[PDB]
C-alpha cells in the first residue's frame, strides 16, 4: 500500500539522468551549509522544530515602538562607499594587514553599534531573557534610545548595567546613575522592575525604584513615585532579573493611586504589573530604552529582611523528583540482591513484635 | 532486532527505544546510543519520531565521501528518535524561614 507525497519530496528536483554533468559540492562545508538551509524551512512532515517548542513559531508582533529613525538610502550608501575608498586606498593599512598587526578602537565600535543595529541586539537579547513575555506579554519594542545604568562601588569604581550582565546586591544597595540624551521639551518616566521573585503571586513583580516627569537628562528633578529599594533575592533561588525601562510621556501625567509612601519598605505596597500600569497611561507613555541585569543572593541581602522589612529570611532549595521505580514484584526474577533496598521505606531494622 | 517503543509512548530514563543491526533509525534529541547500536531514553518523557538532515562527522570518511559526490541541490535525510522531556528539571521549595 503506497501513499502519495504531500507537496514536494525533498530531492526530487535534480535529474538522475546524466549525473556526470551535474555540478557537485566537493566540500564537506558547502554541504553543511545547504543542509542547515534545509533545516530552516517548514517541511510538511513531522520535524524537530514541531515537537521541540520553537516557542509559538510565527508570532504576529504587537509592536509598541518608538517609530524608526528616518534617514535617506542613497546618501548613506554613497558616504559609506567613499569612506571605504579612502580607507582601502591607504597603503599603511595594507602593510598593517599583511604583517598581521592591527587593532580596533573598541570604544568607537561601541559608539557605532550603539548607532545602527545595536538597538536590535538589545531587542533580541531582551527576547532571549523573556523581558517581553513577563512585562508586555504579547509585544515587542525596539530600544531606540541607549540607556546607561551604573553603581558606584567605591569612590573610583563604577559597575555598569548592560543588558544581561551579572551584578551583586553589594553594588545594588545604592541608587543608580543614569545617562541618556535628549533636549528638554522632553518628559520622561523611568522604571525599575523585578520580573520574578514575588513570593505570593507567581504572575506579579516588584518595582524597586520608579521615577516620573523627568525633563531632559535631569535625573533628580524627576518626581519619584517609588524611592529606591535595593534588589533582594532569596538564598535558594538564584539569579533574579532586573529591568530598566524608559517611557516618553507627551503631556505631564500625575497619578496618586500609583504614588506610594515615602519610606515604603512594605512588600504588599509594591505589587506590580507592567501590563496594567501601562494600560493606564498608554496613550501618553511610549516605550524607549532598555538595560537589565542578573542578580543572585549575596550576604548583604541578610541585612535587608532583618533591618528593612521586619521579615524572616526565606531560604529555598532545589528539589529533583524522587527516582522512578517499577511496581514492586512479589518474586523479582533475575534481579540483583540490592533490588530489595530500592523499595526500602527508610533505613532501620524494624522488629515488629520482638 | 526492532523497534521497542512507539510514537507517543511514555518512557523513563534508560528504557530502550529500538535495537538494530545497521543504522536504520538514528538517535535524535535525548536519545543515547549504545555500542550495539541501540537507542535508549536519557530523560523521562514522550517518544517522537522525525525525519531530518544528515550531516556526518568529518572523522568518518565513508560518510564524508558520500557527502562529497552528491549533486549540488540535494541533501541527505535519515530517520530519528527523540524524547520530549515531560517532568520539569526541578522545583524550588521553601526549606526554612529564619
Amino acid at each position: 500500500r503506497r501513499a502519495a507525497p504531500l507537496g514536494p519530496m525533498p530531492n526530487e528536483d535534480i535529474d538522475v539522468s546524466d549525473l556526470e554533468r551535474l555540478k557537485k559540492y566537493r566540500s564537506f562545508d558547502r554541504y553543511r551549509r545547504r543542509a542547515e538551509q534545509e533545516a530552516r524551512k517548514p517541511h510538511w512532515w513531522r520535524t524537530y522544530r514541531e515537537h521541540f517548542g520553537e516557542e509559538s513559531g510565527p508570532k504576529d508582533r504587537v509592536d509598541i515602538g518608538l517609530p524608526p529613525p528616518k534617514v535617506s538610502r542613497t546618501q548613506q550608501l554613497l558616504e559609506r562607499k567613499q569612506a571605504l575608498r579612502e580607507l582601502r586606498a591607504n597603503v599603511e593599512e595594507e602593510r598593517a594587514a599583511r604583517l598581521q598587526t592591527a587593532r580596533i578602537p573598541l570604544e568607537a565600535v561601541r559608539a557605532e553599534w550603539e548607532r545602527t543595529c545595536g538597538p536590535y541586539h538589545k531587542q533580541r537579547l531582551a527576547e532571549y531573557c523573556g523581558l517581553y513575555r513577563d512585562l508586555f506579554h504579547g509585544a515587542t519594542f525596539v530600544p531606540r534610545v541607549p540607556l546607561h545604568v551604573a553603581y558606584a562601588v567605591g569612590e573610583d569604581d563604577l559597575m555598569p548595567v548592560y543588558h544581561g550582565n551579572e551584578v551583586t546586591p553589594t553594588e545594588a544597595a545604592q541608587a543608580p546613575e543614569v545617562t541618556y540624551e535628549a533636549d528638554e521639551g522632553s518628559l520622561w518616566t523611568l522604571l525599575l522592575t523585578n520580573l520574578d521573585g514575588h513570593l505570593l503571586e507567581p504572575d506579579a513583580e516588584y518595582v524597586h525604584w520608579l521615577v516620573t516627569n523627568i525633563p531632559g537628562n535631569r535625573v533628580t528633578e524627576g518626581q519619584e513615585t517609588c524611592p529606591y529599594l535595593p534588589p533582594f533575592p532569596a538564598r535558594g533561588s538564584g539569579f533574579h532579573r532586573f529591568a530598566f525601562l524608559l517611557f516618553k510621556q507627551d503631556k505631564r501625567i500625575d497619578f496618586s493611586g500609583d504614588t506610594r509612601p515615602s519610606p515604603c519598605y512594605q512588600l504588599a505596597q509594591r505589587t506590580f504589573h507592567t501590563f496594567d500600569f501601562y494600560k493606564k497611561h498608554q496613550d501618553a507613555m511610549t516605550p524607549a530604552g532598555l538595560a537589565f541585569f542578573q542578580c543572585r543572593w549575596d550576604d548583604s541581602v541578610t541585612r535587608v529582611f532583618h533591618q528593612l522589612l521586619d521579615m524572616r529570611e526565606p531560604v529555598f532549595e532545589f528539589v529533583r523528583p524522587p527516582p522512578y521505580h517499577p511496581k514492586q514484584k512479589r518474586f523479582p526474577h533475575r534481579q540483583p540482591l540490592r533490588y530489595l533496598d530500592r523499595y526500602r521505606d527508610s533505613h532501620e531494622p524494624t522488629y515488629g513484635i520482638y | 532486532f526492532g523497534i521497542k517503543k512507539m510514537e507517543g509512548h511514555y518512557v523513563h530514563a534508560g528504557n530502550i527505544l529500538a535495537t538494530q543491526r545497521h543504522f536504520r533509525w538514528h538517535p535524535g534529541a535525548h536519545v543515547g546510543l549504545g555500542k550495539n547500536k541501540c537507542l535508549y531514553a536519557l530523560e523521562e518523557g514522550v517518544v517522537r519520531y522525525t525525519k531530518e538532515v544528515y550531516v556526518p562527522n568529518p572523522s568518518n570518511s565513508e560518510a564524508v565521501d558520500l557527502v562529497t559526490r552528491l549533486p549540488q541541490g540535494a541533501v541527505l535525510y535519515k530517520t530519528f528518535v527523540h524524547v520530549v522531556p515531560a517532568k520539569p528539571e526541578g522545583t524550588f521549595k521553601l526549606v526554612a524561614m529564619l
Binding site: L6, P10 | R69, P71
Partner: peptide, 19 residues
C-alpha cells in the same frame, strides 16, 4: 515506511553512482 507519504525520504543511492 512503505505505507507513509514520506517513504523514500532517506533514499539516496540513485544520487551517487559509484558502481
Amino acid at each position: 515506511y512503505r505505507s507513509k507519504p514520506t517513504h523514500g525520504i532517506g533514499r539516496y543511492k540513485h544520487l551517487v553512482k559509484a558502481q
